[model samples]
Target: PVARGLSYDFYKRSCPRAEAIVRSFVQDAVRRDVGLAAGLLRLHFHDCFVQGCDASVLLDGSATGPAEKQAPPNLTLRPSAFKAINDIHDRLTRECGGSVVSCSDVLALAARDSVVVSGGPSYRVPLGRRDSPSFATQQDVLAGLPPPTATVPALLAVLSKINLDATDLVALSGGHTIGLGHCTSFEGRLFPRPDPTLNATFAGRLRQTCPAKGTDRRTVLDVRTPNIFDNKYYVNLVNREGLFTSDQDLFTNASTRVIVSKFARSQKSFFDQFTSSMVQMGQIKVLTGSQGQIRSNCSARN
Candidate 1:
């Protein structure tokens, strides 16, 4: 009864309406709250990076110390993103007569739908991932995701561990074209002479947003076209307007600068690479065959 590998039609027989259900929920959620588009995109990244698109990031924690959601990098995942998945899972249960669709696939499909709804390219992602029975530990979670303060080499090093090369790294980072980040992620760039890579006017604007030390104010990741998903993120990097050190370094570092320039020059290049990079990330360490369970609820183990 379990699928052996990912396929576009993995749920064709078991849950013929699975992708449709997730797509409808995601479209509706993003329409209701346009900001949810970025949140869902981020949710997919967080889920994939930590445990290979297994939906472990969706697990709720217990009285124990912490789970993936409690991890520092994952703490910012919006509640609205979770609600969207839960709503879709609930609908799938009712319409499909049971919990036949894996929450992992729902997350994946929702992420694709989010991109489409947010003015990005639409590409079919192979499905059939099963929900992780166990969530990652706090230490594993911390070690898995790269920090905002990461330098170009450090960022590439971390991503390389998962087989992502410079092109993939730059393209995947383009996802920042639509998300929000806490001021803490980039405030350091504003103070102490300001990071030279930052444009002076943009720095001044950001200082206005978070002047005091340790401010928790949130800022849009992409200053230009924040709600739209495009290569403008790479263009911002070239303009020294990147909010995070990791982002700016894509232009500052010799190896990645060319990638930034290429994407800035060609939106088509960014979109093509981004689609492939997303698929690459989605397939990392995935659970296939009978490796994991199909959960009834996205936030808990079956």
Candidate 2:
């Protein structure tokens, strides 16, 4: 919990301070339609798993920091990256008695709080997730983590490992609706001409920012709905304008097409289903009891 202890209820006693910190982040993210808070939870995994979830991914770009929009490859790479967090769980046990926590648990709570803080419903997050000591494997991370350019079949294969179907995949991609993407994360789809689904205007804009050469600083993916959290993302998919190819693929793929269409028509429905999927994601193998607990802050001690 030390890494993510602040997630569950570091608030009951901390009062306005903790709640306000999270709420402030959520309010800003919701208002801007940026999924920054949610990314906070996600990027945590990206950082810890690769080199050790040092919260380095959260660092801003400055004289003494990592990239603003991306984490180091060590953090971003699969398997070893995740192992870093498990080590934290062990350290947590020493630091916080038996009530220390797993980095994965922090991710779960961070996801929940980030969602709820952004004016979404707060649900009872099930506890007792075990930290997986073994990294899920490179093949598994490639297979498990969704890529920006994943095709329908590829998407299905990844989500299916966790028991999610096409519907859940579309709902999950909705997370991208709020989170911004660095050009490095999405520019390849624009420069390459494999698919024509992306609107030329949107593609052109991305090209201008990212170019064929790979040197741009703008966070371009969520621009259409950059400042508000809502259904425009679904609309983007329908327009063949989804920022990530993996995102727009849902609209074109036979397997996920139906879900994309439904989400396009009714964002409320999408939000409902997305929430369900998000909750389920949080439930994946969490450790509990003396194994993990609420942290006073979101970082792990060295």
Candidate 3:
């Protein structure tokens, strides 16, 4: 029925160019560094998984203490990603004649645009989401984000708290089909006892870039088609070449293995489910109908 307090035509009246501005900005950004598409799409997920889709994750800080961005887990968020968000805020407020557009709405729209630019699924995001005047605490963000090492049960338990399900987790992780991974996120698989699930050949190659001895570096998430946002992430899992423990666990666990196999076999199935899951994820907990402010500047309180 209704998508909470959102609508496809959310800014038809106040900010007629809201959707136009976001798509244009993200398209230009991704043209320069295609990998930025991954960061931008992920920025929205990180923002929503915590305090809903209210821009709480975008807050720089508040008078009382540090905000979500200051949290250890958040410290790794891409600077270019947040810069695009703040830039989106500037352009929208300028084009729309003040702060008629909310930062949360900008995030939701940018996420969809990023995926589409990378040749992934296209979906309409319901808008009118408002910025949270307050921020989610550090503890809240850490508790909310599932780490790269999480097993299927642990991942589900984390997602269920926000109403996401098995399908959403699998499809969203499909985003790994694009983007780079840091050594820290997957080094454990190489050091100590190797992850038996990792393909032996793949593990050997990863060592050249992601050394067992801790050193910061970049690794492609899906080696088969590293920069394409397709079903290859699922394919990689099936071959036991998944870059992270969290990535391979989907194929290792029986409950999720069936879903992973389906996605691996059909790109169309993966894209369709991806669009629907993203639409559902964006609705986690949104502020609308004047519940929160539309800040002229996205990072601070009005």
In model 2, which runs have C-alpha deviations exceeding 4 angstroms?
A: 1-35, 44-103, 119-121, 130-140, 192-194, 288-302
Give the Cα-based TM-score of candidate 1 against the true structure: 0.94
lDDT minimum window of 10 residues, candidate 1: 62-71
Between the candidate structures 2 and 3, which one is better when assessed by lDDT? 3
| Candidate numbers sorted by TM-score from highest down | 3, 1, 2
In the range 1-302, model 3's lDDT, one tens digit per residue, is 23668899888888888888999999998889787888888888888877788888777773112233333332467667878988988898778787888888888899899989888888888888878888667667667778898899999998888778899889989989988888888888888868899899999999989665676788889899887889999999999999989999999988799999999999999999999998888888788887988877777778
lDDT of 1: 0.83
Deviation (Å) of 148 in candidate 1: 0.6
Residue 238 C-alpha lDDT in model 2: 84
Per-model TM-score, in order, reads 0.94, 0.67, 0.94
Model 2 lowest lDDT segment of ten: 56-65
Over 85-122, each residue of candidate 2 has an lDDT whose tens digit, in order, gives: 33333444554444344444544555556656544445
Query: Candidate 1, clashing residue pairs?
Result: none
What lDDT tens digits, residue by residue, belong to model 1 across residues 1-302?
12349888887888888888888888877777999999888888887877578888788752111232333432656778888888889999998866688888888888889888888999987988888878666655677777888998988888888788999889999999998988888877876668878899999999998897678778899999899998899989999989899899999999899999999999999998899888887887788888899889888877
lDDT of 2: 0.54
Per-candidate local distance difference test: 0.83, 0.54, 0.83
